[PDB]
Design an enzyme around this catalytic site. Structure first.
Site, PDB file in Angstrom:
ATOM      1  CD  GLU A 136      -3.196  -0.784   2.046  1.00 12.61           C
ATOM      2  OE1 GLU A 136      -3.038  -0.102   3.063  1.00 12.61           O
ATOM      3  OE2 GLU A 136      -4.274  -1.429   1.876  1.00 12.61           O
ATOM      4  CD  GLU A 225      -4.311  -5.365   3.333  1.00  9.59           C
ATOM      5  OE1 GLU A 225      -3.146  -5.753   3.311  1.00  9.59           O
ATOM      6  OE2 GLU A 225      -4.668  -4.221   3.910  1.00  9.59           O
TER       7      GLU A 225
HETATM    8  O1  DCB Z   1      -7.400   5.136   4.673  1.00 11.16           O
HETATM    9  N1  DCB Z   1      -7.246   4.072   4.212  1.00 11.16           N
HETATM   10  O2  DCB Z   1      -7.762   3.903   3.126  1.00 11.16           O
HETATM   11  C1  DCB Z   1      -6.450   2.999   4.694  1.00 11.16           C
HETATM   12  C2  DCB Z   1      -6.502   1.776   4.054  1.00 11.16           C
HETATM   13  C3  DCB Z   1      -5.725   0.685   4.456  1.00 11.16           C
HETATM   14  C4  DCB Z   1      -4.839   0.781   5.548  1.00 11.16           C
HETATM   15  O3  DCB Z   1      -4.013  -0.222   6.002  1.00 11.16           O
HETATM   16  C5  DCB Z   1      -4.116  -1.509   5.333  1.00 11.16           C
HETATM   17  O4  DCB Z   1      -5.297  -2.263   5.701  1.00 11.16           O
HETATM   18  C6  DCB Z   1      -5.325  -2.872   7.011  1.00 11.16           C
HETATM   19  C7  DCB Z   1      -6.411  -2.178   7.826  1.00 11.16           C
HETATM   20  O5  DCB Z   1      -6.053  -0.810   8.097  1.00 11.16           O
HETATM   21  C8  DCB Z   1      -3.944  -2.803   7.669  1.00 11.16           C
HETATM   22  O6  DCB Z   1      -3.980  -3.662   8.795  1.00 11.16           O
HETATM   23  C9  DCB Z   1      -4.024  -2.959  10.029  1.00 11.16           C
HETATM   24  O7  DCB Z   1      -2.725  -2.423  10.190  1.00 11.16           O
HETATM   25  C10 DCB Z   1      -2.573  -1.687  11.421  1.00 11.16           C
HETATM   26  C11 DCB Z   1      -1.237  -0.979  11.348  1.00 11.16           C
HETATM   27  O8  DCB Z   1      -0.217  -1.974  11.208  1.00 11.16           O
HETATM   28  C12 DCB Z   1      -2.726  -2.700  12.557  1.00 11.16           C
HETATM   29  O9  DCB Z   1      -2.557  -2.025  13.821  1.00 11.16           O
HETATM   30  C13 DCB Z   1      -4.098  -3.366  12.473  1.00 11.16           C
HETATM   31  O10 DCB Z   1      -4.221  -4.354  13.497  1.00 11.16           O
HETATM   32  C14 DCB Z   1      -4.262  -4.000  11.092  1.00 11.16           C
HETATM   33  O11 DCB Z   1      -5.553  -4.554  10.941  1.00 11.16           O
HETATM   34  C15 DCB Z   1      -2.939  -3.319   6.653  1.00 11.16           C
HETATM   35  O12 DCB Z   1      -1.656  -3.460   7.203  1.00 11.16           O
HETATM   36  C16 DCB Z   1      -2.796  -2.247   5.572  1.00 11.16           C
HETATM   37  F1  DCB Z   1      -2.374  -2.860   4.410  1.00 11.16           F
HETATM   38  C17 DCB Z   1      -4.783   2.061   6.258  1.00 11.16           C
HETATM   39  N2  DCB Z   1      -3.970   2.229   7.357  1.00 11.16           N
HETATM   40  O13 DCB Z   1      -3.411   1.314   7.934  1.00 11.16           O
HETATM   41  O14 DCB Z   1      -3.996   3.387   7.822  1.00 11.16           O
HETATM   42  C18 DCB Z   1      -5.584   3.131   5.810  1.00 11.16           C
END
Ligand code: DCB
Length: 300
Positions: A136, A225
């Site tokens: 990402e 994902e």
């Molecule tokens: O705004 N968005 O579109 C967006 C989309 C996807 C995204 O992040 C993405 O999608 C999930 C959910 O956010 C993340 O997983 C989350 O990662 C966090 C940080 O390691 C952990 O604490 C949490 O337990 C875990 O579920 C993945 O690593 C990342 F590829 C994020 N992000 O992590 O901020 C933001």
């Protein structure tokens, strides 16, 4: 059975196809970060996912930062364990260079090139492997044309020197949502796909229309994902919108991996706190998200 039947995957007219040129759709699970929840990634759990859920792909999410590979490279050995399990289980496997906080894939590009050289040397003569070179990309200062495409044009040659044509998934801007810009400025390699990621907590009608725009440019898309939760991985489960996306992906022949296989107390997690890391989960050991995802893959 899966890999023996479908064999070598490739892209034909923007579609994932098998070695006989027929469309194929992969559906499976992603690990959570291997530095945190690697105990869920093993032959026995993967075999349970294959046999009880019907998965035909598993994604090994190797965070680079956040205590991942750059901090402690021992986690690459867990990726190898996952790949070897997939080979033994005859399913496909995604090797995911899981950038996130390190929001520009160029930050660790030298390490990425070395890592993908090693993986493609080890595993490049198996049809199981799919390389996901930058989970990402994100941030307003990380664009397709200026950052992501040139990164890909450095890493892909490294892979191709060892593995001429297994699939490579390339992340897109804005947390792998900006498939529009990628589709308008595609990479040369014929066996590339662009990542598209969604979270069902976000109302998705325009995002579906953007995926269709990209598909209409002849770009291949892999939904490497997605979650039933909000974009944070938490905040509620949104099964109505998830089902809309499931149906969309089936109509468009889009392969996918759900986030994620862990017992963490967050809504996207597939497992409840007491779930055995080696599989065998009862209904009570699956979370509301996991129960749904398992049903979707079994139905398929
Ligand atoms: O705004 N968005 O579109 C967006 C989309 C996807 C995204 O992040 C993405 O999608 C999930 C959910 O956010 C993340 O997983 C989350 O990662 C966090 C940080 O390691 C952990 O604490 C949490 O337990 C875990 O579920 C993945 O690593 C990342 F590829 C994020 N992000 O992590 O901020 C933001």
């Amino acid at each position: 059975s899966v890999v023996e039947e479908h064999g070598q995957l490739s892209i034909s007219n923007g579609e994932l196809v098998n070695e006989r040129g027929e469309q194929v759709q992969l559906k499976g699970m992603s690990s959570h970060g291997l530095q945190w929840y690697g105990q869920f990634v093993n032959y026995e759990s993967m075999k349970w996912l294959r046999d009880d859920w019907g998965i035909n792909v598993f994604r090994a999410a190797m965070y680079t930062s956040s205590g991942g590979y750059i901090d402690d490279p021992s986690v690459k050995e867990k990726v190898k364990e996952a790949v070897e399990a997939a080979i033994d289980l005859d399913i496909y496997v995604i090797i995911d260079w899981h950038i996130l906080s390190d929001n520009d894939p160029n930050i660790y590009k030298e390490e990425a090139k070395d890592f993908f050289d090693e993986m493609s040397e080890l595993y490049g003569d198996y049809p199981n492997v799919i390389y996901e070179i930058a989970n990402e990309p994100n941030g307003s200062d990380v664009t397709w044309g200026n950052q992501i495409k040139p990164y890909a044009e450095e890493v892909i040659p490294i892979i191709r020197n060892n593995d001429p044509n297994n699939i490579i998934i390339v992340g897109t801007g804005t947390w792998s949502q900006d498939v529009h810009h990628a589709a308008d400025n595609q990479l040369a390699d014929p066996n590339v796909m662009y990542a598209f990621h969604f979270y069902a907590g976000t109302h998705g009608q325009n995002l579906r229309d953007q995926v269709d725009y990209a598909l209409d440019q002849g770009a291949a898309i892999f939904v490497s994902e997605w979650g039933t939760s909000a974009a944070t991985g938490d905040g509620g489960v949104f099964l109505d919108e998830a089902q809309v996306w499931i149906d969309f992906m089936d109509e468009r022949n889009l392969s996918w991996a759900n986030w994620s296989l862990t017992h963490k107390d967050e809504s996207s997690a597939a497992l409840m706190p007491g779930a055995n890391p080696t599989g065998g989960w009862t209904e009570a050991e699956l979370s509301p998200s996991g129960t749904f995802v398992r049903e979707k893959i079994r139905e398929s």
